[PDB]
Amino acid sequence: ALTQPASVSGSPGQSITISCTGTSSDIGGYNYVSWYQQHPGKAPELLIFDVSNRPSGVSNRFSGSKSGNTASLTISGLQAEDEADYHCCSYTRTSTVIFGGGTKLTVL
Amino acid sequence: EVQLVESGGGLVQPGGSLRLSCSASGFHFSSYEMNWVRQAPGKGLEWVSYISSSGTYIDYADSVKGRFTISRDNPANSLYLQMYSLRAEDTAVYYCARRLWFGELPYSYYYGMDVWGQGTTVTVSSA
Amino acid sequence: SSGNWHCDSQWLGDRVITTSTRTWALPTYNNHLYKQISNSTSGGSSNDNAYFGYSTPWGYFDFNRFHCHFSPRDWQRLINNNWGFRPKRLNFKLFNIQVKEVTDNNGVKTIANNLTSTVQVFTDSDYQLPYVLGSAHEGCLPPFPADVFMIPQYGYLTLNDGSQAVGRSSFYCLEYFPSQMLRTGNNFQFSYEFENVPFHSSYAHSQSLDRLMNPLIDQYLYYLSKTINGSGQNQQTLKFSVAGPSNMAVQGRNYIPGPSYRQQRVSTTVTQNNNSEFAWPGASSWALNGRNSLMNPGPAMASHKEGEDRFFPLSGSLIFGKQGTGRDNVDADKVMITNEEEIKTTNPVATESYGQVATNHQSAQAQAQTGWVQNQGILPGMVWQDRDVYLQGPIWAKIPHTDGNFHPSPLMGGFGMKHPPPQILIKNTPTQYSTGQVSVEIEWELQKENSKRWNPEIQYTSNYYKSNNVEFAVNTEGVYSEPRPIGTRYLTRNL
Amino acid sequence: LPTYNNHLYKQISNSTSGGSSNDNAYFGYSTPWGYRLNFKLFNIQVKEVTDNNGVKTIANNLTSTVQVFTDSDYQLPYVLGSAHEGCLPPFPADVFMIPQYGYLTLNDGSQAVGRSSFYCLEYFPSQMLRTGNNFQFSYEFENVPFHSGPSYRQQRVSTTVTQNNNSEFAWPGASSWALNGRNSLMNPGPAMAPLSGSLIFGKQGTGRDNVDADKVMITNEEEIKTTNPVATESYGQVATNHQSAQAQAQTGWVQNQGILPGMVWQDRDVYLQGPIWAKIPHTDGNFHPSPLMGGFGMKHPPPQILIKNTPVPADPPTAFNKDKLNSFITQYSTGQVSVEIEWEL
Amino acid sequence: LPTYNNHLYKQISNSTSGGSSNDNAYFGYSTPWGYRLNFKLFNIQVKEVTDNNGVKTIANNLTSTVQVFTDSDYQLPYVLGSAHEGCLPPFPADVFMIPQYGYLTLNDGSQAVGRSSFYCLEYFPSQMLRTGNNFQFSYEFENVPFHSGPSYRQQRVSTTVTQNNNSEFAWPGASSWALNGRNSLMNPGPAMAPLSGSLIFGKQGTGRDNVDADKVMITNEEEIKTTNPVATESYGQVATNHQSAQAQAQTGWVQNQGILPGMVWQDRDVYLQGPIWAKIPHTDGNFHPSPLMGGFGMKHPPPQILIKNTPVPADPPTAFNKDKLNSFITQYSTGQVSVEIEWEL
Amino acid sequence: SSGNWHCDSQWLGDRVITTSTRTWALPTYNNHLYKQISNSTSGGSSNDNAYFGYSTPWGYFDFNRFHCHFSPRDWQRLINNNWGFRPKRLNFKLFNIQVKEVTDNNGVKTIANNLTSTVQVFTDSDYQLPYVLGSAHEGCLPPFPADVFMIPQYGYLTLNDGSQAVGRSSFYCLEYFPSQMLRTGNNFQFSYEFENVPFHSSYAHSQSLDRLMNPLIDQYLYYLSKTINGSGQNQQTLKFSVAGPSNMAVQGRNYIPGPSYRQQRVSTTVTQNNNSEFAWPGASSWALNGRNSLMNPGPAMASHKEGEDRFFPLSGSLIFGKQGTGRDNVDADKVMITNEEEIKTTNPVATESYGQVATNHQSAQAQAQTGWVQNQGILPGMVWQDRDVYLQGPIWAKIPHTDGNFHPSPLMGGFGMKHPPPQILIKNTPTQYSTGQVSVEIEWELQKENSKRWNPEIQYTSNYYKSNNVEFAVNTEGVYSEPRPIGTRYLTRNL
């Protein structure tokens, strides 16, 4: 699957970045990734689709990047709302999707 | 006003069977794919299966593969996941989700899942 | 058969000529009587709700809504290709008037033709009646021509003290106007000319007011930047910097966005809203002579900020309803809520402040106090977009005769006028009803797209969806339903 | 007139320039183009630069060309109204550089929205000029009124530093209007007899950053103080309730006022370093279109004039290659610029 | 001319017929309208029907109207080339029923792609006829050939049953053409000397279903066989390989052969039971437009003529209700219908 | 100056005027020579790839692709509001010619104006040379006007047996044709009139070929429903039934779908494809004079059945490629695959059989036997649609001059012409190169949209979601790009 950290923390006001690393079939070769925030007991909400593309409902502060063989979500201007568990999703070579362990964001 | 709400089922015995159903309201259901993903209580999301709008392509991630089926009734706007030979390895909140679509002509694909179901809890336990 | 059926619209150059013809039926209202109506008959349990008026036997026609004159395909041709439009000429026909007599024998009833009976129709070109077409009332000609509709009963209101009348209150007998009488062989028509109005903009700016600047070049104006040299005591200073594209907020500008009168914010996700009841307490209103009035839809403003769909102004936007939607306390899903997202370039956001000002003078001991501006009237050098018309919306209103006004363009959209299309009043000449045909025509002058934009636009497009039934079409039972509100602003211009 | 961006149009955004904050965020494109009434452009001299080894040898270029077009339908973004640098110099003998063209379109964050546009100025017709060719046009202004109340309050700032409060109130106390989630400073603001209230020109030699107060020329409008409210003053008082036996008469301050019937006001004053005209945005409604930095407003202002040095391709390889050509002869050009602006008193 | 669908446009589909086969699935609508060349419609009558208890009462209604238009722009869908019942009858004294108009559109299964179209016939201008009004128009025919080889093999079935196979081969044995994956029986097919390729008419009074051979008239196209191929015989033979010292020659049968330069053929023979004209589907290209069911294929065939009873409501209520009026006086109309066609010999 | 800069489009009634001005740079090819070229130099390891011919020093101009003449916007404008288009006039101007001469001493070259050099440029209007424009080769003017391009090198191929020539081969000398010679004060203009061509069909049929019927009525025609009564011996019988809305498979239809040549089926999910190298062996291919050659793209056929988008016909598509795509063995998502599915109503699917036919004659001892029809050419009564034209595709191709042809429209789509726009050859005069300007103009005639359709159309639109770059626009580095292939079939007509 896609390996991403167990947790990340940041102080309010400053931009932080989560990464998820995958094999050349998952990410390195194909440009499929996408990012989801989730709150406990709520259905996930999409943030970023494709690499950098973003849906209309989602806020400004969320962006995305692919440095190759890796994918990263950059959150800007942390608030109290931004606390959630961020997930990494990328359709594979065989067109079957895979996720990663989820990463909790703790705003101090 | 886009609403995915699934009834599904609760506690069930190992080795038994279960039928999860979903209800798509507010959006055209026949165009989109649909996904079943599951979140085990302490662990992250895992994608069980997906079904195409026409039903031509139905693919299963191989954990389940062979033990579940997936069906969708377009006039009834309802997705179905029926499962047999349940294990404890399957206990999760199951989500009814659909993938991104933008209403264009064929050969256009978008990667990500636009709208999500609020979930149904499935407990497969012997005791 | 004194007239024929005319419906289709033709597009010629910078003009659109659309025609709709409808089949109508008129009942007998108030038992051929005038009846004074007050609230005390309905109970009028509040003073904001008090009224005094007269329910009259007369009927009237209202074509004031757009989808009367445009098919959802011909609304597309308009909005995709055109920057502006506005009405020029009107033509109104009333023909094939057929009066029937309803015979009641025991419980069953037979109905027959009554030949000598006449129908009276008079239209007011001196505007001596109260003009009720401007409140976007129900009873307009149906959107789908194959439906047959029932003419609404005429009525009006006038002054009151509480629910009782006053010495200045009025009474109008429409009988005292001259009218025409028509038997089964008579038709009625008259032609109209709209007064000069501005083109209704149907485009979205390709720039925002605050970004008009050139990204490559410093301004030659300077702004105050550092008022302190750092941390310490008696550190005051005055430092000045150039306005430049690295810092674009502080630059000087020639124009500033439209006016605002704030609204409360309501979320589509019910769990986020407060548990209290703010529908009436929360709403922003305006008090006239002890009677409050909900501010609806209100001044033209954006509906929500960027990346925040789930919110809508409580009383800031027009709300329609889907076919089959009941009258009272329907679910949120049933109603369709329009949003102003296009005008967010030059117009302030409804749920947000206009801005800030300073409330004091600073000195050695007195910090700068700023406070929020909730409502801001017109200042010199404001620019604002009016509200967008919808396929379902009102076309014109009548500008209340007064000493003064500012920008008479009405708040629910469309074109303000001092002499709108005149009201058209009708009755059964005194168990009798009458049917007929009505073909209304309007002519629209167009403003074509001159834009040099390189990349493709944003168009109103039907999705490639495959569903149970086609959109903007009848379902199995024969019900014709409109699934969405369609705004006029898609193409872009520079600001 | 240098040669900008290697003859490329390049997307520029907030992220490209470092992305400091949301308020200052932008998205746009940059161009190789640079930018009664009368205008003439002549004496075209096209000068190729050649660097052989380490020294620069500047020669004429005879065949090479220059392009110009006026935008008389106002189809491109109008940048001439923002008080940018690069205006003709006040001293008639100076040789001025032509500033680059680029524009801002719709942006969300540093990203581009669906309605964000892109303009290729190559997609305009334009007049090509060799060394002996010239260009001119005559513009006729629309009729505006001769050059010679409501208030939105400004903070009061003093030139004596001791008087000002010892805190950083440059942006915290600044008047600003909020438009779609971004605070724009209120500058200079509605004309009143002020932290952001008055136009500030920098003196000759005064730099880009953090210059002292004696190095900038601060205009004042106090000449209007007979018809207008002061910039930092409350417009008045209003009654905040009803009197009665136990209810006193109660007043509160008007920190901002709009128009009323019965008001009169005078505008901000033109200056000799200041702007002449500005464009009135295209909008369904506006009030008192006269621009807020001073001068005359117009709905068809003096058109922009756009000019570039047409690229001269460098030697290419002998075997066909489908890519565009990236290698070009270093080049520039110059000449004369004459303009005639009539005035009526 | 009865009143169809109670003055309603109604979506119809495959599941609304009960459906259950994919090759049979369809989606579309049904309309309240019914449907040199000269034409006149005159002496109209409006017959209103009341029922007191159970006795019906036919009453003259002189005041009522009837609607008609013709579609000369071919803007509406065109069903007239499909051999439908409801034409002017063979026997000149017969009185006939005006058939219903409705049109199929695109589907996938019983649902509708976003490309499906919905036409509202109320949206043309139409001429409304009372009892004294007449309606008349002419139509000129475009240049068409005076009415007087490739093969796609048909399966052979015998009218002597002991000659036929002892199995159900009606559908499994037939030549079909799949279009978008829906198997379509090939009928009548290309003109040939025929399990699914022969026009078959019913004898007077014949039932709808499971009728036997004696009840229907099975035509045969043997007359055109001189210059055409046998429907039950392979077009010919070909070589399947190369002979050698080690390889005997081999052959194979030609079940179907497209056009080749220099083919001559006869078209299908037309009957007084069969159709006259068809509409060529507007397309980039076609070959030999002559309709496989015979007659004159045209780009602008004779217009469609659409007609309905103008709805007159029953007594509306006494206070206004925005709902449309669903209660209508029972009614149906009749009159005189005269078609006149000039012919060339 | 010898010419001005004109780029824009004018929209007048049914006419479109497309004005493009590009700037070219032409080097010297073949060191001023003619050269034999053959397979054996490059290694010629295939009999299908064996060629013989000559590469000439000249260049040529090619505008034969659409993105030259139409901005992405004006393409969108054309597709949404029109039912067809076609070229009328052609106007071409060559001006501002320059010739640079190269001198390189050791490391660094110095390029200086040579004023007296001449440029040889002529147009062949009698089509005496080999005409390579209809082959969809590279070297056409760049889509984006600011980009400068390298004029292609001309060359041609004559007959061969393997690498070796034959006596009926030809050698054409581009020096033999009279050619105007241009210096830096000269400009070359000619005009051209397009021959009669059919309007390109740019609409998707609303109804399919088999649903032309009326759903409400039976046909008077009869079909064979039952060949046996039940289970057992001697059940032979003949039963018949009306063809009706119950069973629509069998109704007699005037028209039948067009030709087919079956293509192999490839899935864009690589794990549904067979684990073998079937790319060359599997694909359809036509043979000529012993040389095999692929069938590409082939007859115009729908790409896939309705609802199956991961399949594309192996060789039967127009596969463009994204900006930056490599030359060789690029991954499947580096390329763009067009689909013709809009025609699927009239035309068979490319990966499916056109139908079946009956092989034998049934008897008591034989079952009726049928077989798959793989390739079915024209039969009388067929209707079909041609292949679509894309913003990135060819415009025209030259109809080979031959005894005869059927449906001259070219199989890669566009407008076939017996006298297409002529070739324009150019060269430097015999280390030096030229640079100059080109302004080409075409006048296009339009077919206006007539539809009465009630519910709104599918339009082309730019999708509404935030993205890093605006589509059909430069990136940050300056590289223009075209995100996807835009066909023209959007509006709809009846069949």
Residue numbers in the entry:
A (entry chain L): 23 to 130
B (entry chain H): 20 to 146
C (entry chain F), F (entry chain C): 224 to 653, 672 to 736
D (entry chain D), E (entry chain A): 249 to 283, 312 to 424, 481 to 525, 536 to 687
Please quote the authors directly.
In each map, the capsid was well ordered, while the densities for the Fabs above the 2-fold axis could not be interpreted for model building. As for the 3-fold antibodies, only a single Fab bound to the 2-fold region, in two potential binding modes, resulting in distorted densities during icosahedral averaging. Thus, the localized reconstruction method was used in combination with symmetry relaxation to structurally characterize the 2-, 3-, or 5-fold regions, independent of the entire capsid, to reconstruct the Fabs not conforming to the icosahedral symmetry of the capsid. For the sixteen 2-fold binding Fabs, this strategy resulted in maps reconstructed to 2.54–3.56 Å resolution. The localized reconstructions with C2 symmetry relaxation confirmed that only a single Fab is bound at the 2-fold region. In all maps, the VH and VL chains are well-ordered, enabling the building of atomic models. The epitopes for the sixteen 2-fold Fabs comprise VR-III to -VII, and -IX of the AAV9 capsid. On the aa level, all 2-fold-Fabs contact D532 and Y706. Other frequently contacted residues are T491, T492, R533, D556, N562, N704, and Y705, which are clustered around the 2-fold symmetry axis. Furthermore, for all the 2-fold Fab-complexes, movements occurred in VR-IX near the 2-fold axis.
